[PDB]
Amino acid sequence: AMGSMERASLIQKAKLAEQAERYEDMAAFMKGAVEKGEELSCEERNLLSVAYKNVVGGQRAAWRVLSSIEQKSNGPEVREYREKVETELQGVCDTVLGLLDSHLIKEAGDAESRVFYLKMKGDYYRYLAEVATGDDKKRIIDSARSAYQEAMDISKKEMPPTNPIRLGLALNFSVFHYEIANSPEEAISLAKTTFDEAMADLHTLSEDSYKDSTLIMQLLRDNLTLWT
C-alpha cells in the first residue's frame, strides 16, 4: 500500500499525521516505513509506538464501553458490535506483532532497540489478553509474560535504573501482573523496587534527564497509591 512511497516521505508524513491527530494515518505511514526493511531510529521507534498506541487505545476504550453494556444486559446487537470492535482491535494487535516478528526484533542488536521492541511485544499481547477468552487466553498471557521478561532481563543488565524505556517497561509489566496475571503482589513489588532504584540513581542525571525519569516515576507512584 505504502510500497511506492519513499521511506523519508513516509516518516515525514507520519510526523504530519501526528500533528493533525490522524493516528490511523500515522500508523499506516509507520507500517510502510517498517516494511522498507531498514532498522528504525530512536525517534522513528517512538513514532511507531505513538501511532499504534493511540489507535489501539481508542479501540480498547470502545471495547470497554461495549463490554460493560453487554454485561449489564447479561437481541444480538450489543454482542455483535462488541465482536466487531474486538475483531478490529485484534487485527491491529496482530499487525503490530507481525511487524515486530518480521523483522524488527531479529534485526535489533542494541539493548535500546531490542528492549523497546520486546516491551511493545508484551504490550500488544497484553491488549490481546484483555479481550481473550478462548483456548488461547493462557498462551496469550504467557506470550506477554515471556516478552516482558526478556526485556526486563536485558534492561537490568544493559541500562541504568532511570532509563525511560526501562522505567516504562517496568511500569507496564507491573500493570500486566496486576490486571492480567492476577498477581497484585508481584505488581506492587515490581513498581516499588523500580521506583526506589530510580530514586537512588537520579543524582547522576542532567536536569533534562531528571525531568524525563521523574515523569515516569510519577506514574509508578500513582499505581502504588491505587494498589496499597
Binding site: 522505567l167 511500569l171 507496564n172 500493570v175 490486571e179 506514574l219 499505581n223
Partner: peptide, 6 residues
Amino acid sequence: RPSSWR
C-alpha cells in the same frame, strides 16, 4: 484503571 506508559 492503572496507568501504563501513556
